[PDB]
Design a protein around this nucleic acid. Sequence first.
RNA 1: AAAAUGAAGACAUUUUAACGAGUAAGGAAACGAAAUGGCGUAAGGACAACAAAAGUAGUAAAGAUUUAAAGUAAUUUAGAU
RNA 2: AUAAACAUACUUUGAAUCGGCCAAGUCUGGUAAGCAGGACUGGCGAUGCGGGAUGAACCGAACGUCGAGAUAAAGUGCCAAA
RNA 3: CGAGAAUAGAAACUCUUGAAGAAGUAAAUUAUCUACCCGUCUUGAAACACGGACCAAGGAGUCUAACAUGGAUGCGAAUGAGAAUAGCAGGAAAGCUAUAACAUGAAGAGAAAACGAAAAACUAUGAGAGUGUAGAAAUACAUUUAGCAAUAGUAUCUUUCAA
Lengths: 44, 323, 210, 167, 148, 60, 129, 50
Amino acid sequence: AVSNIHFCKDWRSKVHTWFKQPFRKIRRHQTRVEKAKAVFPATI
Amino acid sequence: SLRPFVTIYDGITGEAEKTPVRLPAVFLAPIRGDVVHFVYRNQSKNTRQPEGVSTEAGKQHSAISWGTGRAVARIPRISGSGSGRNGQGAFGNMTRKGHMFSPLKNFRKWQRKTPKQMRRFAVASCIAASAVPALVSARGHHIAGVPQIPLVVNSKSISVIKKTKQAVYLLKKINAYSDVLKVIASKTVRAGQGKMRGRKIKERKGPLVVYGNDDLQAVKAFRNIPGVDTCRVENLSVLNLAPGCHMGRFIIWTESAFKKLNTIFGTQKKMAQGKSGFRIAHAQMAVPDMKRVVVAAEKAKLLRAKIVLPKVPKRANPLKNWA
Amino acid sequence: MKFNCKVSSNPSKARKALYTANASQRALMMSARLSKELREKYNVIAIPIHKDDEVKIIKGHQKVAGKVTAVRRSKYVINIDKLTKTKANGQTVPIAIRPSNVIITKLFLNKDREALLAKKAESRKSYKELVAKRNEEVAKAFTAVYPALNMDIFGKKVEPITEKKPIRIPSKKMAEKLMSKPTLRAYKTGIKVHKAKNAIAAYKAALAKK
Amino acid sequence: AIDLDRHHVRKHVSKTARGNNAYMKLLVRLYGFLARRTQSKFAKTILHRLCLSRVNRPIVSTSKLACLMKKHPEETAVCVNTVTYDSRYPVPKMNVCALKFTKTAEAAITKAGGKCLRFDELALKAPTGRKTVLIRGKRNVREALKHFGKVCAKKNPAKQYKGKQTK
Amino acid sequence: ATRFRQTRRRRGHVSMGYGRIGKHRKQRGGRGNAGGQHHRKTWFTTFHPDYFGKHGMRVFHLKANKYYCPSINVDSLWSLVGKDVQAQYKNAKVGEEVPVIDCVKHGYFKVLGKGFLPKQPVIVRARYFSEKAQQKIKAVGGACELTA
Amino acid sequence: SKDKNRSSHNQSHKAHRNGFYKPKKSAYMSTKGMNVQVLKNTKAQRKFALAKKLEAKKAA
Amino acid sequence: IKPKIVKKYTGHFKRFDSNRFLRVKASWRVPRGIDNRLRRKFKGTNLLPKIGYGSAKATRNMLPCGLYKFPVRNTTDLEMIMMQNRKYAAEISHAVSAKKRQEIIQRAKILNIRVLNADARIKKQEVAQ
Amino acid sequence: SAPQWFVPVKAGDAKVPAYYPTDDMIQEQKKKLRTRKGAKITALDKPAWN
RNA sequence: AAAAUGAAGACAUUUUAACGAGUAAGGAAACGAAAUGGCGUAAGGACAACAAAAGUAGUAAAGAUUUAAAGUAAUUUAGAU
RNA sequence: AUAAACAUACUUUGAAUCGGCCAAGUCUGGUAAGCAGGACUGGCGAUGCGGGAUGAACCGAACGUCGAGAUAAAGUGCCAAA
RNA sequence: CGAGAAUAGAAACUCUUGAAGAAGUAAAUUAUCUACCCGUCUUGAAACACGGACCAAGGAGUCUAACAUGGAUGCGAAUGAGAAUAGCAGGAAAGCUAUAACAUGAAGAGAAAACGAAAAACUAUGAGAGUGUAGAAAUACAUUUAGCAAUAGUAUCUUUCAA
């Protein structure tokens, strides 16, 4: 199969890793809870 | 499916309950070591933390090779003068204080994917092996004294356990303390460079206490006991039921968790409820035994008699051997 | 297991904070235990050590009892007048002792130890009354489920369940065929060894009977 | 030495159960015993087909079983492979022995009044094989076979693995 | 599993399985698909014989949603409602109540005619129909309905 | 840097290690490019015979 | 009863040029040089390990006393060969202390098992004792 | 009866397991080595086969 | 390679027959009659005195120097200092 | 006629390689070459062993570790077994 | 005189050496035979071809991404949904649960417009199952039946200027 791979540019500076993903849940869930406690109609 | 009965014991009084419970259908799933090995090999890597060397480690010099005509190799050399470092080796892989072979990068693959249905296959095969006393003991558990290897305790006794003195008392009543003392007596220290990283103590594995939704207060009691791990019935995985990829963990079920098993995993004919899309598989063989086929074929006079190979005589010389 | 995310379980970080701790936290670390006579008088387990105190060495070559002559917090040691070693040419030098190998037998209590000891005493009592409140609550919930029993059963001997009800499961025939060779051989040898021990035990009992 | 045409090299025939499946290991133990003792060509066939790789044991659908069992009313189809379900066509009453049955195939066969047997029950009931019909699925239907060869060929061109700018 | 690679089995062999006469050098004919018409022409002729050239008209902005048209054959129509419903209405004819197969509700737009339908009346509701699809539905006693 | 041009040395020894692959039987039985009228007659009878075979199947 | 143990080669297969150079150790390595004297099996230097040198299957891994070695770490590990005393011989590991060695030695005498390290880590009772 | 491989020996007050019998009911047996028979003595007149 | 036997023995079964040179190169792991067999380095999860104190260790660990033993070999085991 | 069931037919994936050299009851150019280039086969390369004193190709013959015998090329005054 | 066969008969031993060290094994020396410098390029190196004074430690097919073949694994007209993301217990970079957008596949041909598959198939050889006879131990013939996989060839149908 004819290969079409776009790694000629500096991909090493283009690499984005998702190591913060398990902590986005904790951030968003906690903030989502905090808004509910502030004015529960708002988070509706 | 006759599904033999299972007794439920009182953890405080030691008295069996008057109402037996049918064995859940999850205990008759095929016990596939190869499927468990595939899942455990993938899942055990999911706790790994990213690591990597410095990106600029060993590349922080302006070195260029001296070229030929100087009676030295062509590896790059540090520039300048006045110190011992100048004129020495440079970035090269084999040089001292240079970068190594392909440097480890923090974007490696630390976690491994696995299909969900193959993960549920391995848990059912790991649960079934926990009801085989031969496989439980061969894994390294002392279960010679327990009444039933699918050990269930009353949910009434569990609800009263609030201290580790009571949790230890219950474990003594149901004859499960042999494993707890094996872990206590055999605790030792790690052998190697793992002690500088903080990993010093190396204990063994003991009973696993599987509890339901009504047993959230008894968790705190069992957690300080050495070599006793607790897990909720829904959160079972290969990392609990087969530590070290050796199936047959000694499990202590509670009444609430034992009865929920049928709903969670379903039967061989009913699709599961807790795990939608999954159904217990049928083993390649209906009855995993070879004796009943032989005796029936023997009764039909089909098998030939057992053959013992004749002793082939050694070659002789008829011209010289009269016999 | 630790659950406070602020504190660290790293052995290296613990030692670094031990060496670089200031004088304020060094005093509270060189504590010693009171003796029986002093414990009964004050109801205090341990207090930080002080100069002009009288201690008794309990671990070491010489278990002498003397007076504390130096509390060296930089070296985390203390000095006793009785424990000395002659330095060849004739002069004697004190021998350093870790403060965890001694127990105090006579306090040097001017005015701040008195305030400390009273504060240390009430803290013990306040915790004792709090543990008692929890213990009855645990006992109260145990009676509501087993009204015929009392909580003292947990401190006595335990009688194991001797009933041996077996279960028929259509996998015991496959048990030998579900082990790998390294764990099959060990399992079979354990069976062979166990049988031979039972054979000798049986023969011995027959000889004992006869 | 001796002028041989070629030296002795391992024969390229499997003789045991591939993998670490404990149940499939016992099936080969059972039919290796039956074929050796009964000396029946049926057991030698089932033993051989149990030792093929997964790719060489293609599936058979309920539609294909129905067509092959049309003129064999009281018979037992025997296919050493997974039996899937063809939802397009109805499933009549028949007895099938196979290594594994799809959840939908097992329901369809049972609901029609038939039976789903495993190979130990077949050996217990028909060891030498008396009212059975040997069936195997098609092999050339694999899509991998399309790309084999040279796609520039004049006679039977291949299928040109797709890639960069394929028209 | 780095312990199962061929590198661990070739330790002690000088060239690591790459040859002595022809070494393992940096390149073997260019980087990427280089030389597609000079020295790798026999590769492109042999294995991608239509790689170079042009064909067809350019679509400056292709609206790929206008070509979306999932298809289902006639024999597969009854699988949308299952065999349980199919047997229930097996003995119906004109005049009484007949199940309706909503292909659009299941994501199927065009109904093609391939295979054989069960000999029961049925109402097929869809967006497009093949000529042979409508013939096979009508030849069995059914009706075809348009949508959208 | 003159080099040797060509040699048939060792070529026959190579061609006989895996000997001359004869064609299969189906190679000789191909019918593409046969006589036009002959193919028409053969097709006519194969259509006639198939229809007769099929109506008996439909009859039973 | 003891069979006759026959060894086809009692010497050692030393590495090539291990005698001339101290950086080359004596552990065997197959010479892969294109012009190597030993690999080409010249006269004089044609001594390589080959499977034909293997000893008889019956008497393989058998000590000269006629028994097979069995390592033991405590008295309980002796019971695993307590029924095969005519085939196996005990072997106390190199790290077992002198105190635990006495228990193993005195227990094996009870079970009638041969021990090969029976004179290991003995105290100073050699002269005037 | 004792297993064929079990030949009990006396323990000089050394620690013994539970299963191993006490020496009071353990009787020593003299070690036996010879297993072949000597040559038979025939008549003075008759000659040996050898 | 072919016969026989086969839930565990064991030496990777038993018997018979043919065979064994080799640069470049190949033969990943698993697969009871095993679709090559193994040695070594370091780390992670388990197992290691089955009767409630369960691998070794101040009655001397790792390491170093040698003497012997096992293995065709990679190497392993043990004694002495 | 003779041989052929570890026969036969293969399918897929892939390694290395396309600097060659020698012999001759062979050929072409050249005065000729241990020169240059070819047809057929066997070899060396990749190959050790016995003989030709010594030798990549010559003659016998191809190799798991050994014991006993009959041999091959070729030898039998001494080196050197006869 | 005598094969077969029937009937009766017969084999258990000596000497020497060895804890005053047997047999074997190892080390050093001697003696006969034997042995050119390793790695590499090369048709060919022990080469008057190149690197190598000696020792220790370090030292070179790895990681990410796309495709294909192949062996083990789950499910199967579906598979995946550890797509983001949202919840659960426990405090958790781990574990469990989410009727779900989509990815690949189930339909193919055409540049595109426009379309979109049965004569409920045929022929040949082929896996398997019986019954009888006989040798006679296994096995060798006769005969009834079925004809899967695979290969090849046919009709028929979709698309294409063109199969």
